[PDB]
Amino acid sequence: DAIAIVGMSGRYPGARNVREYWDNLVHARNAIRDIPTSRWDVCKSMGMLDDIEHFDPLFFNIPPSEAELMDPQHRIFLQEGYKAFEDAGYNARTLNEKKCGVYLGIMSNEYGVMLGNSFAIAAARIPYFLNLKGPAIPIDTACSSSLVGTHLARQALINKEIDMALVGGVSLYLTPESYGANGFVPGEGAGALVLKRLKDAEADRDHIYGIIIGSGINQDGKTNGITAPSAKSQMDLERDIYETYGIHPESISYVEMHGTGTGDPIELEALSTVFQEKTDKKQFCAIGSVKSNIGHTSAAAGVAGVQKVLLCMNHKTLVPTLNFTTPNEHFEFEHSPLYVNTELKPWETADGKPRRACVSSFGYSGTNAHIVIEEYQPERSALFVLSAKKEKQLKAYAEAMKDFVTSNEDIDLEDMAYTLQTGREAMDYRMAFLADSREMLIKALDDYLAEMPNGSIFAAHVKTKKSEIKLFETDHDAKALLQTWIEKKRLEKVAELWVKGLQIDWNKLYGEYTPRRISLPAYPFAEEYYWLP
């Protein structure tokens, strides 16, 4: 039935993550810049990612020398994909042998040619690293790729062929060669979503961004030139989805258009016509395109749009679409169900109905996709733990957490700790601390970073402390003592032992109030430069 989106990660022009992405959208920021000479010597504009050469190959058990031979599209998605899992609150341990499919939108080979680097391998990186067992399939339907992938993952989950799916897209523009409405400006990006059956997501107590309640794909078929759109195919696609899944156009209040700024009028007419077949209501449905902010992120276009929509729903807020002064002459808005939203405003819904939105993505090869997303409506000291594979990254992790807590005054401290305990892998470099308030939490992380002694803070490298924790691992009364500590109160003791490498049973910390996993900052990868050898 319904598919839950339980994890997301994103890296788009002007946005290193989904929180910056949201902030940029709220403030109507445009990330399009002139192409610098460090890329190539110069349309002279692009929605660019920063530091596309950066990778943490050691994290992924990849030899540094192999990293130079990897398409950065592979490298960046590997990172974003992984972070999507961590966002959902899953780790290497909990993913091991999971029937998780990987569906990766990808549509260019630039690095391989400039020079392992097949589409087939690009999709297979994450399954190989995490020991996943669902199929790994790259999808090249051009700009519809990530949304096509979403559809396929959706169908596999519903048929119970997999129990989880990582869907995503990645697009870089590396060469000069591969490169009011007047055409589009190319964008770069990488995004991933983690999908589950809704019933599983609720039983597993995942945090849920939203649910997919309908999706479809089809073809333009014979058009006037292979890259031209078909009004009829777009209409059929949208109609068939709404009819198959019992979705009334009146229930939809936002559509993230394909909206490349070429094509535009055909898309508008199609969607308008389909809506009007079912309702007389006027100007109820806002339309936008994040391509106005970040450019045309190609294979990653679908996932960029889906993430925008989920963020909108989560904040119950509609954000401006950009570059709109006067309506396209070829379409008449006044008596349409559609209106272009250029305001930052509250996303209003009537009588506690869940917000619904659509995302469209159409490819130059004629393969179309369209999905319908519905807002999800859900029914003392804590022990904070952090770890990373190097001390430098632990420090970066602490900074990321401090920024996050500073930015989010309403964070549930118990949920956050719980996520750090159960929703992250305990790696070799460790710190832990107690806090009973936001202020104490921020102070602790500050103290850690500034190296100001603080009696609530514990840190160790696990390999150094082996002899010191053995006393607890094998003896029966030591375990009983630890269990008494963790069953339950002293937390200081649990903390000291945990940072030294002792495995803790985090479940025992909680009698019949158990907190929930929430979205937190994911691993801060080492930012090492790798390019052509």
List of residues 6+ apart from 216 with CB closer than 8 A: 151, 237, 238, 240, 241, 244, 369, 370, 371
269 or 468, CB closer to a copy of itself? Answer: 269
Tokens describing residue 320 = 């401006």
**Is 358 an active-site residue?**
no
Coil, strand or helix: which one is 4?
Answer: strand
CA distance 270 to 220: 13
Residue with the two structure tokens 């849920």: 208
Catalytic residue among 100, 143, 312, 358: 143
| Residue 281 beta carbon to a copy of itself: minimum distance, rounded to whole angstroms | 23
369, 148 contact by CB (below 8 A): yes
335 or 489, CB closer to a copy of itself? Answer: 335
* Sign of the alpha-carbon torsion through 383, 389, 394, 400: negative
Binding map of a copy of itself across residues 176-205, x = CB under 8 A, - = no contact: ------x-----------------------
361, 258 contact by CB (below 8 A): yes
| Residue 240 beta carbon to a copy of itself: minimum distance, rounded to whole angstroms | 20
Q: What angle do CA 49, 394, 472 make, to 5 degrees?
A: 145
| Residue 185 beta carbon to a copy of itself: minimum distance, rounded to whole angstroms | 16
CA distance 495 to 518: 21
The residue type at 470? K
330 or 335, CB closer to a copy of itself? Answer: 330
Query: By CB under 8 A, how many residues form the interface with a copy of itself?
Result: 10
Tokens describing residue 522 = 């994911």
- Radius of gyration over alpha carbons of the chain, in Å? 24
**Is 296 an active-site residue?**
yes
Residue 436: what are its φ and ψ, rounded to 5°?
Answer: -115, 5
Binding map of a copy of itself across residues 215-234, x = CB under 8 A, - = no contact: --------xxx-xx------
51 or 332, CB closer to a copy of itself? Answer: 332
Catalytic residue among 74, 151, 207, 296: 296
Coil, strand or helix: which one is 434?
Answer: strand
Catalytic residue among 151, 207, 258, 370: 258
154 or 239, CB closer to a copy of itself? Answer: 239
| Residue 285 beta carbon to a copy of itself: minimum distance, rounded to whole angstroms | 21
| Residue 331 beta carbon to a copy of itself: minimum distance, rounded to whole angstroms | 7
First and final C-alpha spacing in the chain: 49
69, 115 contact by CB (below 8 A): yes
284 or 331, CB closer to a copy of itself? Answer: 331
Residues 323-382 that bind a copy of itself (CB under 8 A): 329-332
Coil, strand or helix: which one is 355?
Answer: coil
| Residue 329 beta carbon to a copy of itself: minimum distance, rounded to whole angstroms | 5
Q: Which residues bind a copy of itself (CB under 8 A)?
A: 182, 223-225, 227-228, 329-332
Active site residues: 143, 258, 296
